[PDB]
Amino acid sequence: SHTVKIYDTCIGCTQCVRACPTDVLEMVPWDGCKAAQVASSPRTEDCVGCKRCETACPTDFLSIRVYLGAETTRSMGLAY
Amino acid sequence: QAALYTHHQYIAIFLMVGAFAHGAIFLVRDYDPEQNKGNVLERVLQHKEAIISHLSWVSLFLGFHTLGLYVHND
Amino acid sequence: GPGDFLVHHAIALGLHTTTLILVKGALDARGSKLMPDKKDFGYAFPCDGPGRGGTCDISAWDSFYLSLFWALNT
Amino acid sequence: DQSSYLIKFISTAPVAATIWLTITAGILIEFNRFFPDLLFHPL
Amino acid sequence: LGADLTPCAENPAFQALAKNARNTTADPQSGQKRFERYSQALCGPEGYPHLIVDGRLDRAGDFLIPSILFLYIAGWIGWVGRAYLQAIKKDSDTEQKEIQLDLGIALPIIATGFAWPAAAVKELLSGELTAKDSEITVSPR
Amino acid sequence: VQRGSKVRILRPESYWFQDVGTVASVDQSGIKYPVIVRFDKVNYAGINTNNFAVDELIEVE
Amino acid sequence: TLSGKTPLFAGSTGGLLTKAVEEEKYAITWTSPKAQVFELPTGGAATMHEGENLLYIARKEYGIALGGQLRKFKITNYKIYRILPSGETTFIHPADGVFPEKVNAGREKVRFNARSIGENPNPSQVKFSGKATYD
Amino acid sequence: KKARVIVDKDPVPTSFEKWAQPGHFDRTLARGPKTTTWIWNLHALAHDFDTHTSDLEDISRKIFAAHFGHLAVVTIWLSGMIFHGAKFSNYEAWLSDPLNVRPSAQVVWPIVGQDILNGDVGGGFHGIQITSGLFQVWRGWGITNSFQLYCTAIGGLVLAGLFLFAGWFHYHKRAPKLEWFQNVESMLNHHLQVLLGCGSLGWAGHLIHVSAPINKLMDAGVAVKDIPLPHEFILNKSLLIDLFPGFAAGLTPFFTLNWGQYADFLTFKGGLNPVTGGLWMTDIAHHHLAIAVVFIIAGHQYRTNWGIGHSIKEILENHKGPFTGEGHKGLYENLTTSWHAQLATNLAFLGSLTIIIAHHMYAMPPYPYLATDYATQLCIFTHHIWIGGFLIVGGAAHAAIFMVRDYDPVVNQNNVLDRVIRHRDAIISHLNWVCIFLGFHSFGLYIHNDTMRALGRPQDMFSDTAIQLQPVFAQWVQNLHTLAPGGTAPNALEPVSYAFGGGVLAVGGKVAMMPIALGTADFLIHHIHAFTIHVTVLILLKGVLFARSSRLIPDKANLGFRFPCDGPGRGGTCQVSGWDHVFLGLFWMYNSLSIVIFHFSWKMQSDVWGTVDAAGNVSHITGGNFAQSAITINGWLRDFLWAQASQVINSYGSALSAYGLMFLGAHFVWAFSLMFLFSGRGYWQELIESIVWAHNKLKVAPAIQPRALSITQGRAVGVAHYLLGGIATTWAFFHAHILSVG
Ligand code: CLA
Ligand code: CLA
Ligand code: CLA
Ligand code: CLA
Ligand code: CLA
Ligand SMILES: CC1=C(C/C=C(\C)CCC[C@H](C)CCC[C@H](C)CCCC(C)C)C(=O)c2ccccc2C1=O
Ligand code: SF4
Ligand code: SF4
Ligand code: SF4
């Protein structure tokens, strides 16, 4: 599966979570930013590696990164 | 003579592209900035924009005028 | 004579432009403005997706790929 | 004012370029019409 | 200079070409006038003017004079272009002034572009030509 | 640094690294990147604002 | 456990292949206020029933996509289930009953790096080691 | 409800304000440029009116006004062509001597030596030889002097003025409401009866009263000065009686159904006029009269304001059967609520029609002295095939744009459109297969042949002298059409085309048209056409059917019509959008039509066109080398491309030199395209970073930040230069060749 890492530069805008077409990401409590929430990637086995989350992320540089790893049936987006 | 010149010039071209390919693989996989602190390799990377911009110029400069003269002549 | 002048200048263009592609590929292999953490993704990778304006052929490997067209042209 | 709007349109990149490169082409074409075949400056 | 170069007025190949010289423009003597001018050049065996670009003063017309005239016009264009960009950057709507020319700003700059070499030297010897490497954006190393 | 102070960026992965931006606000709290800096030129995503830590900034004005 | 009647005009060549029998299958359930037309994940205009609807889908992305379309119909009670060939139905979205874009207490940070992305080590440093530069 | 004129008065105030506000029309663009991507987006979105405003009424008004704009520029162009004919041509010399004088209506200025392009075209005139067939059009019109062209040109400039005013008026001053636009029944009635029906009746009038008499006298060898002016045939009846006795009968035979009294000026001759090698004016007259009647009848089908007539919605709704569920129910709403659904249809069928026109015009040359003008014949065929192919791909594009933007599930549930979406995997899988089958059993035969010939095994080839593949069906149809006159078309004298059979017809020394025999080389090339069309359709149909979704991207409709990808995930999703299928279909359209015009060019030069000996023996331009050469790729490379490129490459220092320059220029533009197609944005943005660094270093960094072209623009620029370069090459090739041999 692909690896999705969140970095402490996250502002908790939730845009990555909303963008994700396979519900990999979710918002979890945090004290690090004003929004008081950080992105998390609990379900990276469902990550297809589309990088919609990175396109969504408004921080410079990105606070979410997808590192494309071992390809599986779920990661290759196969219905067969 | 034609075969042997073409053959070796084609090989030379592959070896030259490989040299730069493996040079890029070195930079991305092997190059330690901390071990190369202050040396010629770090300095080259420090003004890489200046090197690439001047290469862009020489290429454009050669390209415009050489194609220009050929097209003029043609 | 004049024919040898124009074609030597075409060869120079060829050598500088192949170099430009490969050197740019080498010196941007570890990162650029568009992809600052490029070293984390290695030598060969498809892209970093259509975000930030699009990043097709952004890897150091993709400079090797582009350079060989110019190497063959030259 | 409608004059100000035309001047702004004339000064817009593609219209400004067209007028300027037409003048530049015109100058070059006419110079070559009255002084053709200048391969070098004669001495 | 070299590779069977003779004065064009001595090369039989040139005279042969001159007798069948095509009229470039409406002027019916334009064909002859061309070969009359090109007679002073060096011609190869086939009778085409070859240009010598080594900075020989007796061949200054070939490349040296065209070079000076080009560098003066190209430098004008570049300086006027640079001048305008620096002028509009001091205003508020700089991006709009790029795609929609402020002729009030542009035309005076264009007019004063004849004196670009003086302006280029002055600005080179004032540290006002370049920015500092530390104040220009760069990629991570 | 405070509101209106021109700052140069020291973050090397920042689009605006060694570019000048205006400090829009400084969040008076314990957050790691409290200083909101606006920029004249947009990045590749098209945004012109970003959060920075005080150590990543040099006040120039 | 999955209750709901299959929507009308649910048939197309874009439906379940042999994977659904051999590897895994997904279901998406939702309660509709009214019978209304909706575009299927893989083409075709299907009709929702008033009440519980059950649609089998090859990929979880079909469920999330359809979920997004159901939100445009003012429906937010959709549940996606992964179904294995042993008939082991697993409720997978929303994981904890709250939608992931909304913050819920109890969720822990997963794959969080307490650094800026610029502060990752060089590939040379983690060379011949198990770890990567983003670890 | 009733069709009626209903407009809003002064909807948009006319002012230059918005001319000074680039990108005013889009909310995003209105904010202004920040990067150079903005400058591209401005042009890209300019005429995408659906993105300007949501209001269908405002979109309909913009489209109606824009059309008056496009009619004005086309009228300016047609007026220009006729003006250049009146002022800068050898038309009058060409009328006096059609066979010897070469048509020319473009004179070059004497500057930088380009006057060489003003070649000796005959009629003591120096200019570029034209291949647009304007001289043959004007001769067919019965125009015999420069003054008649001047009048027609000025008339055109006035019509172009009227079209500009109309477009301004019908947008800024009196803009029709959406009600008006959605009267499809009234529009079809008026466009069938007036535009086509009355246009065809009107033209029958001109043919019968002006063209047929003037052409008949010119074919009788009467001097152009001696021929009466076209109004003298109306004012002086005696002159017209002398040419066509049927006019003696007057208009009473028309009203009393004694139509045989007009058999002399309304004919069904068939074949070609032996003098001119064009269709008979009297056949063309009767055609346009018959067309006019059928159209005026046809355009009384649709109900407007008087109950009588069909409603198209009821027709569509009633056409359903046991395979197609609700059938054509909901398609009326698609075609009356989406402009893209209409543009898709109209581009697909106008494109298909333009290709039919290409075929019908070479085989049945309708204009006098067209058939023997081999340069015009080749060029108008190739031209109209290209226009046809582009329009068809446009049809597919706008079909995909409709599916993404304007398709409603509610309107289109269990109808023909809905049901095709539900077996799209079965459609595309079968079309995929037939493409591979055709590819192997069409192209593979050429590869078989090349290999057999190369191995010194000609007996093992697919050829007329080896393993034959005779196109027996096309051969059988040719025979039926040849036997038609006297048989299944009793009142025809000759066949519709000599291409089907009959004799060699010759005008001057040259073959106007003769029978186009089909053998193994014709069977092979026809199955190549079938292949290259089926693959283009595979790409475009896949584009339209998978525009909204696929098994890969379920929510593709949300990403839109024109997006570069959905990222490197799922293995990589590059070029999944309906836009990207159009991009790929253009290359295949280009590949397909290239082989069509190459087929036409070589087949006509080897088997049709050529000189005719007094005895009647036909010596063809390439001496019938098609049968044995056009069955291998080597034969195409050698006997077609290599052989016929001699004229274009040897054109320097002559009047055809321009085609030699265009030939290289086009090869360059084509090769340049490969930079855009083979590369990606990422590389170019990183190169621009370093160039921007140097501009920053010297304080010349632009406020509008430079960006590499978008992924989509990269592809758009790629395919644009590829098509331009490729097509322009063949254009230069065809001209230089056919202006020498033809
Ligand atoms: C001189 C010695 C040399 C050595 C020891 C290496 C070694 C290596 N190279 Mg380098 N390289 C070299 C020269 C060399 N290279 C040259 C001259 C070039 C320029 C072309 C390159 C360009 C290059 C690139 C771009 C990359 C490497 C990579 C590598 C590594 C992996 C290679 C691999 O697994 O591919 C497996 C082998 C193949 C895929 C071979 C298939 C390609 C051949 C040529 C196909 C030929 C077609 C067909 C057979 C002909 C048909 C005939 C027709 C008539 C039908 C390995 C460390 C890779 C790496 O990641 O480095 C760590 C990598 O990405 N090399
Ligand atoms: C004929 C084919 C062709 C041509 C002309 C080019 C030209 C160029 N390439 Mg490209 N390239 C090509 C094929 C080609 N490439 C292919 C197949 C690939 C593989 C994908 C690439 C991949 C590639 C890479 C990776 C790079 C290049 C770069 C370049 C530039 C080198 C700069 C230079 O020396 O020339 C000077 C410029 C020219 C010769 C351009 C043409 C000048 C025109 C004709 C003048 C036009 C003016 C005229 C009035 C306009 C008329 C048009 C009208 C509509 C207004 C040059 C623009 C490099 C670059 O950008 O360096 C700066 C670079 O890094 N190319
Ligand atoms: C004022 C305008 C200006 C100035 C002073 C420069 C200066 C420079 N350019 Mg840049 N450049 C410009 C505009 C300018 N450029 C534009 C509009 C483009 C987009 C085509 C580029 C694209 C570009 C590339 C790709 C490269 C350069 C490079 C360079 C450097 C080397 C010289 C060269 O290669 O010329 C190159 C010239 C061109 C590509 C054509 C220039 C087009 C026109 C003539 C300039 C614009 C004039 C403007 C419209 C005038 C308006 C003035 C008015 C409002 C008063 C030099 C610092 C090179 C470099 O980095 O060297 C280290 C390099 O590789 N430039
Ligand atoms: C009556 C015919 C017709 C009409 C009214 C339209 C109308 C439209 N098209 Mg459709 N289209 C058509 C035919 C037509 N098209 C054809 C024949 C094709 C096949 C190529 C297409 C393929 C197509 C695509 C792929 C797309 C459209 C889109 C659109 C919309 C936006 C267009 C725009 O803003 O262009 C702006 C104009 C430009 C960017 C300039 C175009 C210049 C072209 C590329 C090259 C011209 C070269 C020329 C022939 C030679 C001169 C060369 C010389 C100058 C050097 C608009 C509704 C777009 C859309 O999004 O729909 C909603 C869209 O993405 N069309
Ligand atoms: C010469 C260049 C070339 C060739 C050979 C192909 C071939 C193909 N294209 Mg491609 N295409 C090309 C250029 C080419 N393309 C370019 C430049 C583009 C960019 C626009 C595309 C974009 C493209 C699209 C978008 C599509 C295609 C499709 C196809 C396939 C059509 C089906 C078919 O005919 O199968 C039959 C195979 C052939 C005709 C190839 C030659 C067969 C030989 C003669 C027989 C085999 C000999 C022997 C047994 C070899 C093995 C033995 C050996 C190992 C010892 C076919 C494989 C389509 C497709 O896949 O649909 C089915 C499709 O949709 N292509
Ligand atoms: C070459 C190339 C580029 C680089 C090309 C670019 C950025 C286009 C820029 C060219 C235009 C012509 C610059 C015009 C600048 C000014 C408007 C010119 C002003 C001067 C005139 C008035 C004379 C891409 O950006 C790209 C993107 C995606 C896939 C492939 C490619 C690709 O192949
Ligand atoms: S790469 Fe795609 S699937 Fe993976 S987390 Fe990001 S948005 Fe979700
Ligand atoms: S990772 Fe980026 S997009 Fe996601 S919540 Fe954090 S800042 Fe927002
Ligand atoms: S189109 Fe470009 S950005 Fe998108 S997935 Fe392909 S390579 Fe990556």
How is this structure best described in words?
- The structure is cut from a larger assembly and holds eight protein chains of seven kinds.
- In chain D, 72% of the residues lie in helices and 0% in strands.
- Chain D contains two helices and no strands.
- With 141 residues, chain E is mostly helical.
- Chain E has six helices and three strands, in the order βααββαααα.
- In chain E, strand 2 and strand 3 (49-50) form a beta hairpin.
- In chain E, 21% of the residues are buried.
- With 61 residues, chain F is mainly beta.
- The chains are: A alpha+beta (80), B mainly alpha (74), D mainly alpha (43), E mainly alpha (141), F mainly beta (61), G alpha+beta (135), H mainly alpha (742).
- The A-G interface holds A 3-9, 14, 17-18, 20-23, 25-30, 36-38, 40-44, 46, 48, 61-63, 65, 67, 73-74, 77-80 and G 17-19, 23, 42, 58-61, 64-65, 80, 92-95, 100-105, 107-118, 132, 134.
- Chain G: Belongs to the PsaD family.
- Chain G: It is a peripheral membrane protein.
- Chain G: The cyanobacterial PSI reaction center is composed of one copy each of PsaA,B,C,D,E,F,I,J,K,L,M and X, and forms dimeric and tetrameric complexes.
- Chain G: This is Photosystem I reaction center subunit II.
List key phrases describing it.
part of a larger assembly; 8 chains; B: 74 residues; mainly alpha; 0% strand; G: 135 residues; alpha+beta; Photosystem 1 Reaction Centre Subunit Ii, Chain: D; four-stranded antiparallel β-sheet; two-stranded antiparallel sheet; 2 helices; binds chlorophyll A; binds phylloquinone; binds iron/sulfur cluster; 4Fe4S_Fe-S-bd (chain A); iron (chain A); 4Fe4S_Fe_S_CS (chain A)
Ordered list of secondary-structure elements with their pairings:
This is part of a larger assembly, with 8 protein chains of 7 kinds.
Chain A: E1 3-7, H1 15-19, E2 26-29, E3 37-40, H2 52-56, E4 64-67
Antiparallel strand pairs in A: 1-4, 2-3
Chain E: E1 6-7, H1 12-19, H2 30-38, E2 42-43, E3 49-50, H3 64-89, H4 94-99, H5 103-111, H6 116-124
Antiparallel strand pairs in E: 1-2, 2-3
Chain H: E1 7-9, H1 27-30, H2 37-45, H3 49-52, H4 56-87, H5 91-96, E2 104-106, E3 119-120, E4 126-129, H6 134-141, H7 146-173, E5 174-176, H8 178-181, H9 184-219, H10 232-235, H11 237-243, H12 252-255, H13 281-298, H14 312-318, H15 331-337, H16 339-363, H17 374-405, H18 416-422, H19 424-454, H20 472-483, E6 505-507, E7 510-513, H21 520-545, H22 556-559, H23 578-607, E8 610-612, E9 618-620, H24 626-629, H25 633-644, H26 646-649, H27 657-678, H28 681-697, H29 711-741
Antiparallel strand pairs in H: 1-5, 2-4, 3-4, 6-7, 8-9
The structure holds chlorophyll A (CLA) (5 copies), phylloquinone and iron/sulfur cluster (3 copies).
One chlorophyll A is lined by residues 43-44, 46-48, 50, 343, 347, 390-391, 393-394, 397-398, 401, 561-562, 579, 582, 720 of chain H.
CATH class of chain D: Mainly Alpha
- Total domain count of chain A: 1
Q: Could you tell me which chain pair has the largest interface and how many residues each side has? A: A-G, 41 and 36 residues
Strand content of chain A: 15-25%
Order of helices and strands of chain D: HH
- Kindly state the number of beta strands of chain A: 4
Q: What is the distance, rounded to the nearest whole angstrom, between the alpha carbons of the first and last residues of chain A?
A: 17 Å
Percentage of helical residues of chain D? over 70%
Helical run tally of chain A: 2
Q: Can you name the CATH architecture of chain D?
A: Up-down Bundle
* Strand composition percent of chain D: under 5%
**How is the biggest beta sheet of chain A arranged?**
2 strands, antiparallel
Transmembrane segments (chain C): 5-23
Binding site for [4Fe-4S] cluster (chain C): 47, 56
Subcellular location (chain C): Cellular thylakoid membrane
Organism (chain C): Nostoc sp. (strain PCC 7120 / SAG 25.82 / UTEX 2576)
